[PDB]
Design a protein around this ligand. Structure first.
Ligand code: W5P
Length: 167
């Protein structure tokens, strides 16, 4: 049993809810919240800017030190950093940004990072400002992630489309 509430079940391991991932984090304090990161961990808008704002910029300060030491992530890659006031850990995952020309095949690689964590609160990767058509992205999450993932989708019309459309 876990603390996630109101989520609708899609599969054995994937659950979905209309909610802001940041609000899901403050209430649940999950072990892992996933950030929709870029390779520079520059948390400017969407999931990353909203998560970072909720940490009072502590996520950005920590991320700048990580990049200064390690250099940029790979598209499709991830790193584990603090969850600050939102979660124990934040898994920063880089889905491909269609609005920068990145190979959408890298979306499966991105979601494979989730399998290193037994339970996660996450957004749909490469959705929103990353330019990623959402049905494919969900078909990839369900077909890739084997661990227990609680998806918070902020746009109700998109939630509606996905929940009303998931095969
Ligand atoms: F907005 C886009 C579209 C739907 C997905 N999405 C989010 N999903 C959950 N939580 C969120 N908080 C801030 C953004 C956000 C990004």
């Amino acid at each position: 049993v876990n603390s996630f509430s109101g989520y609708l079940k899609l599969t054995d391991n994937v659950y979905i809810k209309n909610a802001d991932i940041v609000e899901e984090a403050k209430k649940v304090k999950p072990t892992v919240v996933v950030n929709a990161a870029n390779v520079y961990l520059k948390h400017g808008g969407g999931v990353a800017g909203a998560l970072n704002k909720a940490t009072n910029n502590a996520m950005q300060v920590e991320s700048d030190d990580y990049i200064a030491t390690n250099g940029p992530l790979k598209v499709g890659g991830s790193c584990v950093l603090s969850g600050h006031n939102l979660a124990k850990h934040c898994l920063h995952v880089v889905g491909p940004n269609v609005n920068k020309g990145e190979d959408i095949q890298l979306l499966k690689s991105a979601y494979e990072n989730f399998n290193q964590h037994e339970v996660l609160l996450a957004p749909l990767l490469s959705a929103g400002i990353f330019g990623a058509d959402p049905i494919h992205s969900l078909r990839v999450c369900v077909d890739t992630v084997r661990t227990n993932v609680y998806l918070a989708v902020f746009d109700k019309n998109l939630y509606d489309k996905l929940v009303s459309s998931f095969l």
